[PDB]
Structure formats: C-alpha cells, structure tokens
Symmetry: C2
Subunit: 250 residues, 2 copies
Amino acid sequence: SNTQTVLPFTGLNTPSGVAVDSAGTVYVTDHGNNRVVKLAAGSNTQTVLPFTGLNTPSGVAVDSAGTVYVTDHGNNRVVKLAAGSNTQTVLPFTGLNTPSGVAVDSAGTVYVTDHGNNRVVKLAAGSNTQTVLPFTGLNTPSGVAVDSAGTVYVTDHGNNRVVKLAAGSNTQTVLPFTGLNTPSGVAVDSAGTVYVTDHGNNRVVKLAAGSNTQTVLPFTGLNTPSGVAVDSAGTVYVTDHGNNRVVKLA
Amino acid sequence: TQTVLPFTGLNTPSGVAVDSAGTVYVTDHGNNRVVKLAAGSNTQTVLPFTGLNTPSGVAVDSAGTVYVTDHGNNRVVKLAAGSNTQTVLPFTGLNTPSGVAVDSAGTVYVTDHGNNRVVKLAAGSNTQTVLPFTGLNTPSGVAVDSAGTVYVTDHGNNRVVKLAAGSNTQTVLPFTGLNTPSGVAVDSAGTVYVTDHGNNRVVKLAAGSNTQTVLPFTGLNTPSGVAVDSAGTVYVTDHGNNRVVKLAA
Ligand SMILES: [Cu+2]
Ligand SMILES: [Cu+2]
Ligand SMILES: [Cu+2]
Ligand SMILES: [Cu+2]
Ligand SMILES: [Cu+2]
Ligand SMILES: [Cu+2]
Ligand SMILES: [K+]
Ligand SMILES: [K+]
Ligand SMILES: [K+]
Ligand SMILES: [K+]
Ligand SMILES: [K+]
Ligand SMILES: [K+]
C-alpha cells in the first residue's frame, strides 16, 4: 500500500514513540504533554494511561501480556504499567542518563538505550541488577528493538548507522543502510525486516532479512519522524514529531 | 565563503556564543563540557565547568562571564572571567532548559523548555521573574538585544516570538517556511538570525523588514545554535557534522 492514514489522535504535542499490541491498540508517548495515550483499533476517542509523574516520555513498548513500558527522559527512569493496573512500577535500572528507547523480548527482558551514556542496558524479568550490552562505539543511542531470535538492533544517532548484536554474541555488525541522516527509531517484525525512521531525511526505510538494498516506504508529508512500530498485519506506524500526528501505512 | 573553526573532539555540539574579543564558545554537548577558541587561535581550552549533564545553551556577557545551561541538571551555571568563581544561578522550577542569554545589565534569560516559559534573573537577585509570554510550545533558543527586547524561538510553533522590555504583548516575527527552529541570535543593527534546523539553513530578518534572506551556508546538517559578533560575522553549530562554521558578514 502507498496510501497512509492519520490516526484520530487529539491534542498531541510532539509525539515521541509508538507501540502496537496484538489487538491493534496503538500506544503513543506525548513528549510535550508528559502523558501516554492509547487508541483501540477502529476507535476514535483516545484514553490517557494512568501513569504518574512523567517528565518528557521518549519511548514506549508493550509486551504480549499488555504491560506498557515507558522511558522517562526528564526523570532518567523507566516505568511500566501492567494491564488493568493503575499503579505504575519503576524498573530497577540504575545510572540512566536520558533514556531514549525501550524494547521487550519474548522472555520479558527489557532493553533500554542510554542516550547520555552511549550504552544499551538490559534487565531480565524479575532481576534487580542490570547488565550492559557489549556494544561498542555507540554515539547517542536513540532507539532499540529485539527480534524473535534475541538479536538487538540499535539506532546510532551520532554515527548515522544502525548496529545489531546477535544473542550471546560480542561482535556487532553495521546494517547496510545507506544515506542515513540521524536515525531516531527502529523496529523489527517477526519476519526479520528492520524498519528505521530517518529524522534528518523525513523518511522511513526498511531492510529485509539478508538483504543489502533498503526500500523507502511511501509515507507522505513526513516532518521529523521520531518513532516506528509494526503490527501483526505488517502495518507500519510512525510518529510525526513536526506534524503532531501518528500515521500508519499498510 | 564560509570557514570551519579548528575545534577538535566535538561530539554533537548544541550551543555557540562569541564575546567582544572574537572568542567563540561552544557547548560540547556529547562531552558534557564547554570549550572556547580565541580569535585567530587553533588551540582550544576546556572551561572549568564541572558536573555538566547534557548541556545545551551557552552565553557570554560584556565582562567575559560565561553562562551555560546545565540541561540535565535543570540549572544554569555561571563562570566569572576574572576569578574561577562558579555559581549556580538561583533559578527555581526549571525543567529541561535549553536556551540562555544575557543583556548589558547582567540579567540572565533562560528558556524553560519543559515548562513552555522564559524566566529571567536580575544581576545579584534571588527572585526570578517569568516573562509574560503566551502560548509557547517547546521553546528552544532565546536572545536579547540592546533595547532589552527578548527573542525566543517558538520551536513547536515554527515561529520566532519577541517581547519588548516592559511589553506584555508579544509579536510574531514575519518569518516564512520555518521548520523546527532551534537557535536565535541578535546583532547591533536589530537583525534576528534563526537556525532553520529542519531545513539545514540559517535565515535572518532585518529590523522592520517583512521578508527574510537565507545565509549562503553550505554542507549544513541539522544545525542547532547561532551567534553573531560585532563585525556581523555569523557562527553556526553544524551539529550533525560536529563542527562550528563561520561566515563573514
Ligand atoms: Cu544529533
Ligand atoms: Cu544528548
Ligand atoms: Cu533532556
Ligand atoms: Cu521537549
Ligand atoms: Cu521538535
Ligand atoms: Cu532534527
Ligand atoms: K521526539
Ligand atoms: K524524546
Ligand atoms: K530521546
Ligand atoms: K534520542
Ligand atoms: K533521535
Ligand atoms: K526525533
């Protein structure tokens, strides 16, 4: 499909991240409004999630159990909200400096890009101490994604590249993306396709698994894309920072 | 023709400033430090600032005193030129501040970006005052001219807003085609310079004029800050290229 639609979100001020669950519900972090809103599939009235004390929400992720994870830029913390609960929980991350992205794998492990510390940290389910991923040369990590094989994908803002790291591997590889200008967000589907928002180019590129030729998705009117998500049906959701809107493309 | 300044080891720089002596100050944001370069020099010096957390803004007054926006620590640090005396300005309730500026009277203006407001502190004062701006949306840059008029980049509204001294009625500068602007600077002749960050260009608007001009910059990649000296020379931080570019004007 080459025709995008604008999700009926209202009152958006600088959308920063986007996530989608199994039921099609789209979660969006509202940077300028210090809130996280969600919109059910087909619905037109968004609801505000019962988060408390948010300061510049930068990234969002949702697991299979409906738990919503949010990186709090202004508070240097990561909070989570279980399904049906109205009491958030601050994950026991430490030493965070401007958390920019969040991802959760099949085992419940939470991955967080540490913008100010040039590192990616992860926290196993129920663990109290974090571990640092063996990435090297990261310049301002901005986004993170993890596929079904445990491979972690990270957008290198300051290096205009996307690096990946297989599970249990200490050798990182640079994805064959071309012409990248300030990558901001990253997402990967169950088929291995990597989707990356190009902040400096106002475009969204994708790269199939094992491919060396990227493809620019036919999004229109993009102004500073900040986040990207992909659902079960392959629809790509993109937060339009400059336009205060969220678009989707089938 | 433009000139690249011999700065070394820059990592995602944000702010830029220049004093009367032509010394250029830049905020090395990715290195949590502020370095300066004297006019005609190629050896930079690191300012004695300490504990900076993701700093963004930088300004310099007549006496050479340097002000930096400690963005990650929600404060503004002052460094006197005479002694090594450092002082955290008594600002209150700051939330992710971005811009900083200072006028001839020593009043420091800081863009409280997270609160969509601009607050000022008089020289030697402990009580801050919120400027009567209305409808600011994620503002980034702030500047002040000789007459005390405060200029702010309404980054979320893609516009530049000014407010005269004593004025409580703001006016929108007739800029066109702005896309997520970041920095603002003001010269002696009342010319406002704005970094069109989303367009990789630097635009300017003379006093009273309603149409703008684009500065002949080349190879700009996501610019952040802008500064102007006495001779009209424009300095811009090529943030995406980790460099500071000078254009004689
Ligand atoms: Cu950058
Ligand atoms: Cu940074
Ligand atoms: Cu910040
Ligand atoms: Cu903001
Ligand atoms: Cu913006
Ligand atoms: Cu940008
Ligand atoms: K954003
Ligand atoms: K953000
Ligand atoms: K961020
Ligand atoms: K970021
Ligand atoms: K980014
Ligand atoms: K962005």
